[PDB]
């Protein structure tokens, strides 16, 4: 970037226009907008694995109800979410979790895939299913 | 689509079959996301009512758009002849790895 | 006691896995009694290959058998359909 001076000579007219291309500083812009999302994870109510809860909640930025959405889930290594819950939130209108992605059994889940039909605008969708530790590790 | 074009008065409707495999050959197994529309010279009219979610097993998929749903779209069916269709599939793995979008127009 | 570890779970689903369709082994194989030669020639084979791999414990055997045994069952479960 200089500062430099031009000079012209002759007849005609023409037309002289200099732009610039960089990086400017984004203000650190929300990189998310147009999906709030927290998640939390506690303990299970004792009745001594480790089973705990995972909780869910979203919302769009938007003025319409977003339409058919996913939502891409990654278990903690060595844990595997209830069977009997996936059912449950499948079963569930507006929510739907693919045949191929049930029947996987406890052995391998690490990766899940809830499809969603759609997601609130004005308040939080929030959903919870249980997960269980089969794999002990530490770290 | 089953035919290379569509019959206004067809009553089974635009049949569209979703084909997925890897780029090895291997086929591929996911979910896809299907859509329709409407084309007038170079304006495009999504047809929301048209979205569809269908698996994909042994990689391949079975999508209809009904013609019901086609003319609901508009607001004359002898009209919407010389318009053209176009589809626009989303398939995404079971692993939520990869997603490709594909489009048949015209 | 705690938990499994890392060979710990697999080594073991897939011995189970294989031990519940060698429970029911004399049930299909005693099923072929009625059927062609093929098929009880077939889990006749598929049967120790199943056997030697779970006292083997060899996660690889035990796999290599356990499709090796679950095939001729479902071979066996279309051949009595066309039975009735």
Same mark, same amino acid.
């Given at each position: 970037?200089?500062?430099?001076?031009? #000079?012209?000579? =002759?007849?005609? *007219?023409?037309?002289?226009?200099?732009?610039?291309?960089?990086?400017?500083?984004?203000?650190? *812009?929300?990189?998310?907008?147009?999906?709030?999302?927290?998640?939390? @994870?506690? !303990?299970? !109510?004792? #009745?001594?694995?480790?089973?705990? @809860?995972?909780?869910?909640? #979203?919302?769009?930025?938007?003025?319409?109800?977003?339409?058919?959405? @996913?939502?891409?889930?990654?278990?903690?290594?060595?844990?595997? !979410?209830?069977?009997?819950?996936?059912?449950?939130?499948?079963? =569930?209108?507006?929510?739907? @979790?693919?045949?191929?992605?049930?029947?996987?059994?406890?052995?391998?889940?690490? #990766?899940?895939?809830?499809?969603?039909?759609?997601?609130?605008?004005?308040?939080?969708?929030?959903?919870?299913?249980?997960?269980?530790?089969?794999?002990?590790?530490?770290? | 689509?089953?035919?290379?074009?569509?019959?206004?008065?067809?009553?089974?409707?635009?049949? %569209?079959?979703?084909?997925?495999?890897?780029?090895?050959?291997?086929?591929?197994?996911?979910?896809?996301?299907?859509?329709?529309?409407?084309?007038?010279?170079?304006?495009?009219?999504?047809?929301?009512? +048209?979205?569809?979610?269908?698996?994909?097993?042994?990689? +391949?998929?079975?999508?209809?758009?009904?013609?019901?749903?086609?003319?609901?779209?508009?607001?004359?069916?002898?009209?919407? %002849?010389?318009?053209?269709?176009?589809?626009?599939?989303? %398939?995404?793995?079971?692993?939520? +790895?990869?997603?490709?979008?594909?489009?048949? +127009?015209? | 006691?705690?938990?499994?570890?890392?060979?710990?779970?697999?080594?073991?689903?897939?011995?189970?896995? &294989?031990?519940?369709?060698?429970?029911?082994?004399?049930?299909?194989?005693?099923?072929?009694?009625? &059927?062609?030669?093929?098929?009880?020639?077939?889990?006749?084979?598929?049967? $120790?290959?199943?056997?030697?791999? &779970?006292?083997?414990?060899?996660?690889?055997?035990?796999?290599?058998?356990?499709?090796?045994? $679950?095939?001729?069952?479902?071979?066996?479960?279309?051949?009595?359909?066309?039975?009735?």
């Amino acid at each position: 970037n200089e500062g430099f001076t031009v #000079t012209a000579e =002759g007849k005609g *007219q023409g037309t002289l226009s200099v732009v610039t291309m960089y990086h400017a500083k984004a203000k650190d *812009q929300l990189t998310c907008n147009k999906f709030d999302l927290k998640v939390t @994870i506690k !303990p299970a !109510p004792e #009745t001594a694995k480790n089973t705990m @809860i995972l909780e869910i909640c #979203t919302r769009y930025r938007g003025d319409q109800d977003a339409t058919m959405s @996913i939502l891409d889930i990654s278990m903690m290594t060595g844990f595997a !979410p209830d069977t009997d819950d996936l059912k449950q939130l499948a079963n =569930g209108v507006d929510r739907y @979790i693919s045949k191929y992605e049930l029947d996987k059994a406890f052995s391998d889940r690490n #990766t899940l895939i809830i499809y969603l039909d759609k997601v609130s605008h004005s308040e939080d969708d929030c959903l919870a299913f249980k997960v269980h530790q089969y794999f002990n590790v530490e770290l | 689509p089953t035919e290379k074009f569509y019959y206004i008065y067809n009553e089974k409707g635009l049949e %569209v079959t979703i084909t997925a495999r890897f780029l090895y050959g291997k086929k591929v197994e996911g979910t896809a996301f299907v859509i329709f529309g409407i084309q007038d010279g170079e304006q495009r009219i999504s047809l929301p009512e +048209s979205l569809k979610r269908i698996p994909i097993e042994d990689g +391949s998929g079975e999508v209809v758009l009904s013609r019901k749903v086609l003319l609901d779209g508009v607001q004359r069916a002898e009209d919407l %002849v010389g318009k053209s269709l176009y589809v626009s599939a989303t %398939v995404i793995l079971h692993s939520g +790895s990869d997603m490709v979008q594909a489009e048949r +127009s015209g | 006691t705690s938990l499994p570890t890392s060979n710990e779970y697999q080594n073991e689903k897939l011995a189970n896995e &294989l031990k519940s369709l060698l429970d029911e082994l004399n049930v299909n194989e005693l099923a072929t009694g009625s &059927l062609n030669t093929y098929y009880k020639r077939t889990i006749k084979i598929s049967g $120790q290959k199943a056997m030697y791999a &779970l006292k083997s414990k060899d996660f690889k055997k035990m796999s290599e058998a356990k499709y090796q045994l $679950q095939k001729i069952y479902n071979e066996i479960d279309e051949a009595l359909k066309s039975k009735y």
